[PDB]
Structure 1
C-alpha cells in the first residue's frame, strides 16, 4: 500500500507525514509532494526514522512522480479561503485524475464543505469520478468532540467516541452527543458542547494570536483517517469512520455520515441513527448553508 500526501511541506503536511511514517503498517510506501523544494528533504529527514515504510519526496509543478502507484492520496495543500484554495485543489485533483484515477482521495484542504465539491466536479470532467473514493476529512471535529466530552464528564479521552455528521463549516458541524454510550448530557451541556465544537478552530487561531491555525491536531486528525482507510484497504473489517462524502442526497449532495470502509473505499453508508430534538433542529437549520457551500464549489468548475 502506498499513500501520497500533496502539500507535505506545510505545517499540516509535515505533521501528517511524520505520523504516517511512524504508524503506517510495515511494507507501506509514503510519497511526499509539495511545490517548495524543501519537500524531498522532508522525506529524507523522515527516512532516517527506523520504521519499515519507504518514503521519498518530490517538488516542483508536476506531482505525477509522487502519484505513481498511489492507493490513497491525501491533499493537505493550501492555506489554513475559497479565493486562494480553489485553484490549488482543482490543480492537484486534475493531476490525480490523470495519474492514479482509481485511488482513494481525501481532501484536507479547507473549506472542505466546498473543496470536495470542486474535487468531484473536476473528477467527473475527466470521466473518472467515483463517489466511493472521494472523502472530505472531518476527523478533526471527531477528536475535538472526544476531548471536550471526556474533559466535561471525567472520562478517559481515548475511550470516548462521539459521531459527528453534517459538514466541516462551523454551523454545519453536528456532534451527535445523544448517541454517546454511557454518557448523558443536560440540555445546556449539549448547547455549550455543540458551540465549542463548532468554534474550536477560532479557539486555536485566537490563542496563536495570528501565527496560524490548528496544524498539529489537524495532522493528527488526517493521520487517523489515513490509517483507517489503509486498514480497510488491507481487508480489515468493521472499520467505521465519519467523512464528508456524496451519498444518498437525503440532506445534501455531500454530507458527513458514518461510513463502513472496505477495499474499494466506502463499503456502506450507515444511517445517522436516532437524533434528539436538539440534533434534529440543528441538522435542518444548517442544511441551507451546506447546500450553498456545495453550490459554490460546483459553480467554480462549471
Structure 2
C-alpha cells in the first residue's frame, strides 16, 4: 500500500505522531521508525497494538550520530513518504546560530541519506525553522540530481490548526473546519486569512488580536511548558493529519486542498511560500492562487514575504557552504 517513515520517531512529536499514524494508515501499509536513540523501544511499544494489516519496521542509528547512517540507508528502501521530525535542543552556552547550524546539518544529512535510496518519495519537513529547512532540503535534493518540486512539503498546518481553534472559540456556535494561513511558518511570516472563511467575523480590533495570537502561539506554548520546550501533542496532530493527506493523495483515495510551505514554481516572486495546493498521485497536482485578501492582510503578507526571502537566503547560504 504505502511505506511511511518517521525520521526522529522517539522524539516528543515523533512518538505521538507515530501512534496516530499507526491508528490511521490504511490496512496494508508499513510504518518505518528511525531514530539515533529510542527507536527499538518505540517500535516494540507500537507493535503490540492490535491494528491488523500494519507492518511496523524500525532501525536504530549509531550514537554518537554518523553521517549517512547505514541503518537509515536500509530502512529508507521502498519508502513513499519521509516525515522529518528530528532535532536537537539548544543546550546552555549554545547561541541561536549554533542551534540553527546543528538542525540545518541534521536535515541535510537525513535528506541526503533517505533520497539517495528513495529519490521518488515525498519529503515532509517538520524540523524548524521550516522557512529555512525546506529550501535546505531542496538544495540537498538538487545536489544529488533528484529534486521534484511537487514532492517537497514544509509542514505549516499547525498554524491552520491554531487559526481555526481561535476563530471558532471567538464565533461559537458558528464553526469552520479550516482557515487559510499563507506566507511562512514563523512569527511575523504567519498570515491567517480570516477574510476567506464564511460567516460574519468579529470586529477588526478582535481579529488583530487573534491573528497576532496565531503568530506568537509557539511562544505561548514554550512559556506554558516552563522549560519542557515547544509544542509536541498539537504538532503530532497537525503532522499526522498532513501525512494522511499525502498518503491518501498518493493512493488515489483523495485529492485534498492543503496549505503547505512549498516551492512556488514561478507562481510567486518568493521561491518558497505557505500557499494552497491540491495533492494527487504524484504529489502537488495544482498550485492555487492566494486569492482575494483585505488591505490589512495584503500589508501583513508584504511584510511576511520580505522576511521569508531572508529566511530562504539564510537556508541556501548554509546549504551551499556545506554541500
For Structure 1 versus Structure 2, the TM-score category normalised by the shorter chain is over 0.9
Contact 1:172 1:289 in 2 (8 A): yes
Q: CA deviation at 1:245?
A: 0.4
**TM-score of the superposed pair, with normalisation by structure 1:** 0.96
Q: Does structure 2 retain, via aligned residues, the 8 Å contact 1:251–1:287?
A: no
CA–CA distance in 2 between the matches of 1:6 and 1:237? 25
**2:163, 2:214 within 8 Å by CA — same for their partners in 1?**
yes
Q: Are 1:241 and 1:258, in contact at CA under 8 Å, matched by a contact in 2?
A: yes
Contact 1:164–1:175 at 8 Å: present in 2 too? yes
Checking the alignment, whether the CA contact within 8 Å between 1:40 and 1:56 is kept in structure 2 is: no
Distance (Å, rounded) in 2 between the aligned partners of 1:228 and 1:48? 26
Q: Does the residue aligned with 2:199 lie in a helix, a strand or coil?
A: coil
Which ranges of structure 1 fall in alignment gaps of 5 or more residues?
A: none
Among 232, 239, 243, the alignment partner of 1:226 is 243
Unaligned 5+ residue runs, structure 2? Answer: 62-68, 90-98
Kept in 2: contact 1:103–1:133 (CA 8 A): yes
Query: Is the 2:189–2:303 Cα contact (8 Å) retained in structure 1?
Result: no
The answer on whether the counterparts of 1:44 and 1:56 sit within 8 Å (CA) in structure 2 is no
Asked whether 1:213 is paired with 2:227, we answer no
The counterpart of 1:78, out of the listed 53, 70, 87, is 87
In 1, the alpha carbon distance for the partners of 2:247 and 2:174 equals 26
CA RMSD of aligned residues (A): 1.3
The answer to whether the Cα contact below 8 Å between 1:40 and 1:59 also exists between their aligned partners in 2 is yes
| Aligned counterpart for 1:101 among listed residues 119, 122, 125 | 119
Residue 161 of structure 2, aligned match among 140, 143, 159: 143
Pairwise CA distance, 1:238: 3.5
Secondary structure of 1:73's aligned partner: strand
Alignment of 1:81-230 (within 5 A): 81-155=99-173, 159-230=176-247
Greater mean deviation of Cα atoms: 236-245 or 201-210: 236-245
| Residue pair 2:184, 2:304 contacting (<8 A) in 1 also | no
**1:271 corresponds to:** 289
Structure 2 match to 1:42: 42
* Residue aligning to 2:268: 250
Partner in structure 1 of residue 15 of structure 2: 14
Aligned-residue offset at 1:162: 0.5
Question: Residue deviations 1:40-88, cap 9 Å, x none?
Answer: 2211110111113211111113312221110001000003641220110
What stretches of structure 1 move > 4 A for 4+ residues in a row? none
**How far apart are residue 160 of structure 1 and its match?**
2.9
Give the match for residue 93 of structure 2.
none
Partner of 2:24: 23
**Mapped partners of 1:43, 1:165: distance in 2:** 36
Q: How far did residue 249 of structure 1 move? A: 4.9
Aligned residues: 300
Q: How many angstroms apart in 1 are the aligned matches of 2:179 and 2:270? A: 22
TM (normalized to structure 2)? 0.90
Tell me the CA shift for residue 155 of structure 1.
3.6
Q: 1:183 to 1:101 in 2, by over 3 A?
A: farther
Compute the displacement of 1:250 (Å).
1.5
